[PDB]
Scaffold this motif. Structure first.
Motif, PDB file in Angstrom:
ATOM      1  N   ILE B 289       0.851  -1.172   0.000  1.00  0.00           N
ATOM      2  CA  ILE B 289       0.000   0.000   0.000  1.00  0.00           C
ATOM      3  C   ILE B 289       0.889   1.223   0.000  1.00  0.00           C
ATOM      4  N   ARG B 290       0.572   2.182  -0.841  1.00  0.00           N
ATOM      5  CA  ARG B 290       1.403   3.397  -0.875  1.00  0.00           C
ATOM      6  C   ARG B 290       1.154   4.367   0.286  1.00  0.00           C
ATOM      7  N   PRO B 291       2.179   5.141   0.660  1.00  0.00           N
ATOM      8  CA  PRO B 291       2.071   6.125   1.748  1.00  0.00           C
ATOM      9  C   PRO B 291       0.892   7.091   1.548  1.00  0.00           C
ATOM     10  N   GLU B 292       0.614   7.458   0.300  1.00  0.00           N
ATOM     11  CA  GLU B 292      -0.482   8.411   0.058  1.00  0.00           C
ATOM     12  C   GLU B 292      -1.854   7.797   0.364  1.00  0.00           C
ATOM     13  N   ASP B 293      -1.898   6.487   0.577  1.00  0.00           N
ATOM     14  CA  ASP B 293      -3.190   5.843   0.797  1.00  0.00           C
ATOM     15  C   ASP B 293      -3.383   5.425   2.234  1.00  0.00           C
ATOM     16  N   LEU B 294      -2.526   5.998   3.108  1.00  0.00           N
ATOM     17  CA  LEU B 294      -2.570   5.807   4.560  1.00  0.00           C
ATOM     18  C   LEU B 294      -2.963   7.193   5.049  1.00  0.00           C
ATOM     19  N   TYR B 295      -3.827   7.203   6.066  1.00  0.00           N
ATOM     20  CA  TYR B 295      -4.370   8.443   6.607  1.00  0.00           C
ATOM     21  C   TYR B 295      -4.434   8.480   8.117  1.00  0.00           C
ATOM     22  N   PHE B 339       0.765  12.024   5.480  1.00  0.00           N
ATOM     23  CA  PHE B 339      -0.428  12.614   6.108  1.00  0.00           C
ATOM     24  C   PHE B 339      -0.589  14.095   5.814  1.00  0.00           C
ATOM     25  N   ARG B 340      -1.812  14.601   5.968  1.00  0.00           N
ATOM     26  CA  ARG B 340      -1.996  16.026   5.728  1.00  0.00           C
ATOM     27  C   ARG B 340      -1.286  16.881   6.790  1.00  0.00           C
ATOM     28  N   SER B 341      -0.989  18.115   6.410  1.00  0.00           N
ATOM     29  CA  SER B 341      -0.270  19.048   7.301  1.00  0.00           C
ATOM     30  C   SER B 341      -0.964  19.296   8.624  1.00  0.00           C
ATOM     31  N   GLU B 342      -2.291  19.228   8.602  1.00  0.00           N
ATOM     32  CA  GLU B 342      -3.097  19.470   9.793  1.00  0.00           C
ATOM     33  C   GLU B 342      -2.989  18.312  10.783  1.00  0.00           C
ATOM     34  N   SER B 343      -2.424  17.186  10.353  1.00  0.00           N
ATOM     35  CA  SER B 343      -2.266  16.070  11.262  1.00  0.00           C
ATOM     36  C   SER B 343      -1.457  16.520  12.476  1.00  0.00           C
ATOM     37  N   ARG B 344      -1.893  16.090  13.651  1.00  0.00           N
ATOM     38  CA  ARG B 344      -1.219  16.436  14.908  1.00  0.00           C
ATOM     39  C   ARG B 344      -0.231  15.363  15.360  1.00  0.00           C
ATOM     40  N   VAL B 345       0.126  14.452  14.465  1.00  0.00           N
ATOM     41  CA  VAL B 345       1.063  13.413  14.855  1.00  0.00           C
ATOM     42  C   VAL B 345       2.341  13.978  15.479  1.00  0.00           C
ATOM     43  N   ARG B 346       2.884  13.220  16.420  1.00  0.00           N
ATOM     44  CA  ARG B 346       4.082  13.628  17.137  1.00  0.00           C
ATOM     45  C   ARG B 346       4.890  12.390  17.430  1.00  0.00           C
ATOM     46  N   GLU B 347       6.206  12.502  17.261  1.00  0.00           N
ATOM     47  CA  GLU B 347       7.119  11.391  17.476  1.00  0.00           C
ATOM     48  C   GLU B 347       6.952  10.909  18.914  1.00  0.00           C
ATOM     49  N   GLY B 348       6.868   9.596  19.074  1.00  0.00           N
ATOM     50  CA  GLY B 348       6.675   9.013  20.388  1.00  0.00           C
ATOM     51  C   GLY B 348       5.219   8.888  20.830  1.00  0.00           C
ATOM     52  N   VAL B 349       4.285   9.427  20.057  1.00  0.00           N
ATOM     53  CA  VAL B 349       2.868   9.383  20.413  1.00  0.00           C
ATOM     54  C   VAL B 349       2.052   8.455  19.488  1.00  0.00           C
ATOM     55  N   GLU B 350       1.045   7.771  20.023  1.00  0.00           N
ATOM     56  CA  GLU B 350       0.279   6.866  19.175  1.00  0.00           C
ATOM     57  C   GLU B 350      -0.709   7.632  18.331  1.00  0.00           C
ATOM     58  N   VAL B 351      -1.114   7.000  17.233  1.00  0.00           N
ATOM     59  CA  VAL B 351      -2.102   7.584  16.341  1.00  0.00           C
ATOM     60  C   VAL B 351      -2.842   6.449  15.625  1.00  0.00           C
ATOM     61  N   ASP B 352      -4.145   6.620  15.383  1.00  0.00           N
ATOM     62  CA  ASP B 352      -4.905   5.615  14.631  1.00  0.00           C
ATOM     63  C   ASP B 352      -4.679   5.919  13.140  1.00  0.00           C
ATOM     64  N   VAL B 353      -4.389   4.881  12.379  1.00  0.00           N
ATOM     65  CA  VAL B 353      -4.105   5.008  10.953  1.00  0.00           C
ATOM     66  C   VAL B 353      -5.146   4.259  10.152  1.00  0.00           C
ATOM     67  N   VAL B 354      -5.715   4.922   9.160  1.00  0.00           N
ATOM     68  CA  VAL B 354      -6.678   4.305   8.292  1.00  0.00           C
ATOM     69  C   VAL B 354      -5.984   3.928   6.964  1.00  0.00           C
ATOM     70  N   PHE B 355      -6.268   2.717   6.482  1.00  0.00           N
ATOM     71  CA  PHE B 355      -5.725   2.222   5.227  1.00  0.00           C
ATOM     72  C   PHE B 355      -6.839   2.297   4.188  1.00  0.00           C
ATOM     73  N   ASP B 356      -6.562   2.868   3.005  1.00  0.00           N
ATOM     74  CA  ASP B 356      -7.582   2.895   1.977  1.00  0.00           C
ATOM     75  C   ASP B 356      -7.539   1.514   1.322  1.00  0.00           C
ATOM     76  N   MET B 357      -8.473   0.657   1.732  1.00  0.00           N
ATOM     77  CA  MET B 357      -8.481  -0.697   1.214  1.00  0.00           C
ATOM     78  C   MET B 357      -8.685  -0.848  -0.292  1.00  0.00           C
ATOM     79  N   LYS B 358      -9.275   0.147  -0.939  1.00  0.00           N
ATOM     80  CA  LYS B 358      -9.472   0.071  -2.380  1.00  0.00           C
ATOM     81  C   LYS B 358      -8.148   0.217  -3.121  1.00  0.00           C
ATOM     82  N   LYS B 359      -7.111   0.656  -2.413  1.00  0.00           N
ATOM     83  CA  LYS B 359      -5.837   0.924  -3.066  1.00  0.00           C
ATOM     84  C   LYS B 359      -4.737  -0.069  -2.721  1.00  0.00           C
ATOM     85  N   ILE B 360      -5.074  -1.179  -2.076  1.00  0.00           N
ATOM     86  CA  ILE B 360      -4.013  -2.106  -1.718  1.00  0.00           C
ATOM     87  C   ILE B 360      -3.618  -3.034  -2.857  1.00  0.00           C
TER      88      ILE B 360
END
Ligand SMILES: [Cl-]
Ligand SMILES: [Cl-]
Ligand SMILES: [Cl-]
Ligand SMILES: [Cl-]
Ligand SMILES: [Cl-]
Ligand SMILES: [Cl-]
Ligand SMILES: [Cl-]
Ligand SMILES: [Cl-]
Ligand SMILES: [Cl-]
Ligand SMILES: [Cl-]
Ligand SMILES: [Mg+2]
Ligand SMILES: [Mg+2]
Ligand SMILES: [Mg+2]
Ligand SMILES: [Mg+2]
Ligand SMILES: [Mg+2]
Ligand SMILES: [Mg+2]
Ligand SMILES: [Mg+2]
Ligand SMILES: [Mg+2]
Ligand SMILES: [Mg+2]
Ligand SMILES: [Mg+2]
Ligand SMILES: [Mg+2]
Ligand SMILES: [N+]
Ligand SMILES: [N+]
Ligand SMILES: [N+]
Ligand code: NA
Ligand code: NA
Ligand code: NA
Ligand code: NA
Ligand code: NA
Ligand code: NA
Ligand code: NA
Ligand code: NA
Ligand code: NA
Ligand code: NA
Ligand code: NA
Ligand code: NA
Ligand code: NA
Ligand code: NA
Ligand code: NA
Ligand code: NA
Ligand code: NA
Ligand code: NA
Ligand code: NA
Ligand code: NA
Ligand code: NA
Ligand code: NA
Ligand code: NA
Ligand code: NA
Ligand code: NA
Ligand code: NA
Ligand code: NA
Ligand code: NA
Lengths: 372, 372
Positions: B289-295, B339-360
């Motif tokens: 799955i490509r990086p652009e299809d992970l959210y 991920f989009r710029s608005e993502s609040r991800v931070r190193e060391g912190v967990e985040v839920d990731v959605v996979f676009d299943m139509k693109k696998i």
């Protein structure tokens, strides 16, 4: 025997003939020039030797090997001939490193790894390519690519080097230097070289011998002195030299003169005798003399009224600083001389002109072939 | 009638194979790219189509003409093939105007002057050479001379143009513009073109179709959308894309999921069905799955815990301004999302990731071939 040999080679396309029944023997180790105007067949001839183009008819040999004879179904692909076309676009893998491009001929022939490495590095240093060994040709400048092809060409030692106008894209000074450098290297290597150029000075400067071509036909093969001083026909005589050789219609007379109608010049004894023996006495021929062999009579070495002198009117004097190019006229005929700077010629004023009779040429009016 | 055709073409050098049983059909008028990493055989393939190299086995056709078939003793050299090789800067005739240089080939084929004029002027207009028609080569820049040479090649109307990353020497900006100009000219001419490049973006930008090669073997031939969205195997899937496609080992389960060990994702119904009919249920496969299809789940359009969503820890966040490259980890497996710029991800912190299943994508783990 010859390093390269063409026997009755033709290349045609329908009614067009690019090369016509050419037979040429290139001596082992010589630097041979193929010289001629655009479209004369010189490039087609180099491509047939290289194997980039097949002859329509004829035989072509590289050393003792017959590499092309269509009547026998023989055609050796260019890579299977022992030749190096020092032409970058064809010789080089743009995505392989410079090092691998130069090593290729050697690894193809299973040369040991250590030997390949030293031979590649040696030729690279010689050509100023050392810092480029790990680059790929797609990243290099045109000049750098040409050098890499040269290194790959000389790293081995083919039986023949082929080049086609390799210095056309160079500044004048660099070109003069490169003509000298390329010939010095060829002599050092001792490898038969066939080089195409349209540049007469380049040809006479670099070549051991020059094969002059015109409209697909080989006109003469000779050293620079032979093609300049003993042109085989009016084409060769008029193609090499600046300003061009002057040509005049004449009748060889029973009393030993070339008569131009407007004036006459006395032939030298030996000239008149050869023309006598061949049957030209009484016939119309073509007379030629170069501008450098015409002189202002004021300073000429030998002035002989009647024999080598004629009064003409000056129409144009180009002052070149080191000499004067003088456009002269005697009635309905004209010719150009290259006179010394000290000459006092002036447009509109008459001047006596001396012809150096030892330097004239006479050609058959019908065939164009030189008698001398 | 394909413009160019290779049928089971091989090129070998001893135990080394440069090109292996390649069959490729290039459509008349299309812009075909040969794309691959160094050593993939792309240049050798172009060289065999040009005729600079004879194939070891196979047939090569230019139009309806068989130009190489070693088993039949057939080998047409380059100049005798209806091809135009585009490279450095070719044989520009000196003392000849731009107009005459372009017209020269037609002057040989004895084309009527009316037609020659129309064709030359038309070609000069497509190349931006109109104001230079009466100029001599010496009065031109190198780019102007290069365009004049291309014009001479274009007026002859070859069946195909061949080039090997001719834009490689250009600064980035000029390259972007030249890719567009080159493709525009090719479309205006409608002439089959084969262009080798190692640059993925250049290939997807310029090609109508792309022949992807790796280690002498044709991996896939498709439009840029096909090679990007429907990669034929893991090599093509991992060779194009930035960041590269993520690959994870998985097992297709009886209940319709791909199990990564550290977590699972549910296959779309049609996907599970094909894997079933092909006998993959219960087997280890390669998932892609490509990086652009992970959210980032925070902004995903559809969040289905257990099925297209997984909780991961963020290891690295690269801030690219217009997006964030996020390196994620779930236990012992990692993958990278864009991920989009608005993502609040931070190193060391967990985040839920959605996979676009139509693109696998799912590939056979032994052959590397894509099921989809
Ligand atoms: Cl090449
Ligand atoms: Cl070194
Ligand atoms: Cl010189
Ligand atoms: Cl002729
Ligand atoms: Cl001819
Ligand atoms: Cl001469
Ligand atoms: Cl006197
Ligand atoms: Cl116009
Ligand atoms: Cl891909
Ligand atoms: Cl938050
Ligand atoms: Mg040439
Ligand atoms: Mg001689
Ligand atoms: Mg001498
Ligand atoms: Mg003299
Ligand atoms: Mg002289
Ligand atoms: Mg004046
Ligand atoms: Mg066969
Ligand atoms: Mg030909
Ligand atoms: Mg897409
Ligand atoms: Mg995608
Ligand atoms: Mg944004
Ligand atoms: N020589
Ligand atoms: N004058
Ligand atoms: N196209
Ligand atoms: Na000689
Ligand atoms: Na000509
Ligand atoms: Na032929
Ligand atoms: Na071979
Ligand atoms: Na030298
Ligand atoms: Na002499
Ligand atoms: Na001389
Ligand atoms: Na001399
Ligand atoms: Na002379
Ligand atoms: Na002389
Ligand atoms: Na006058
Ligand atoms: Na004047
Ligand atoms: Na003399
Ligand atoms: Na297409
Ligand atoms: Na070969
Ligand atoms: Na205009
Ligand atoms: Na053609
Ligand atoms: Na354009
Ligand atoms: Na397609
Ligand atoms: Na698609
Ligand atoms: Na599409
Ligand atoms: Na698209
Ligand atoms: Na995709
Ligand atoms: Na996309
Ligand atoms: Na979130
Ligand atoms: Na970071
Ligand atoms: Na950080
Ligand atoms: Na950190």
């Amino acid at each position: 025997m010859a390093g390269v040999r063409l026997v009755d080679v033709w290349k045609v396309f329908g009614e067009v003939t690019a090369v016509r029944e050419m037979s040429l023997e290139v001596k082992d180790g010589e630097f041979m020039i193929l010289l001629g105007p655009s479209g004369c067949g010189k490039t087609t001839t180099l491509r047939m030797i290289a194997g980039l183009e097949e002859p329509s008819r004829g035989q072509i040999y590289i050393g003792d090997k017959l590499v092309a004879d269509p009547e026998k179904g023989i055609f050796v692909p260019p890579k299977d001939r022992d030749i190096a076309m020092v032409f970058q676009s064809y010789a080089l893998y743009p995505h392989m490193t410079v090092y691998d491009n130069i090593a290729f001929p050697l690894k193809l022939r299973k040369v040991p790894r250590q030997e390949i490495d030293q031979r590649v590095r040696e030729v690279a240093e010689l050509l100023g390519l050392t810092e480029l060994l790990n680059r790929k040709p797609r990243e290099l400048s045109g000049g750098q690519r040409q050098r890499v092809a040269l290194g790959r060409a000389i790293v081995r030692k083919p039986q023949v080097f082929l080049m086609d106008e390799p210095l056309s894209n160079l500044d004048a000074k660099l070109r003069v230097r490169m003509r000298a450098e390329l010939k010095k290297l060829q002599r050092q290597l001792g490898v038969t070289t066939i080089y195409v150029t349209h540049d007469q000075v380049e040809a006479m400067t670099m070549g051991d011998r020059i094969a002059v071509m015109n409209r697909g036909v080989l006109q003469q093969v000779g050293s620079p002195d032979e093609v300049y001083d003993k042109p085989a026909n009016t084409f060769v005589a008029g193609f090499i030299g600046s300003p061009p050789m002057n040509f005049l219609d004449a009748i060889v007379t029973e009393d030993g003169f070339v008569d131009f109608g407007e004036f006459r010049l006395k032939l030298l004894p030996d000239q008149f005798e050869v023309l006598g023996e061949l049957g030209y006495v009484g016939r119309e021929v073509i007379f030629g003399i170069r501008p450098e062999d015409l002189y202002d009579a004021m300073f000429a070495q030998v002035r002989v009224p009647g024999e080598n002198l004629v009064r003409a009117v000056v129409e144009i004097v180009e002052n070149l600083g080191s000499e004067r190019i003088v456009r002269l006229r005697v009635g309905g005929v004209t010719f150009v001389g290259s006179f010394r700077s000290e000459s006092r010629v002036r447009e509109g004023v008459e001047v006596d002109v001396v012809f150096d009779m030892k330097k004239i040429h006479i050609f058959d009016k019908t065939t164009g072939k030189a008698i001398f």
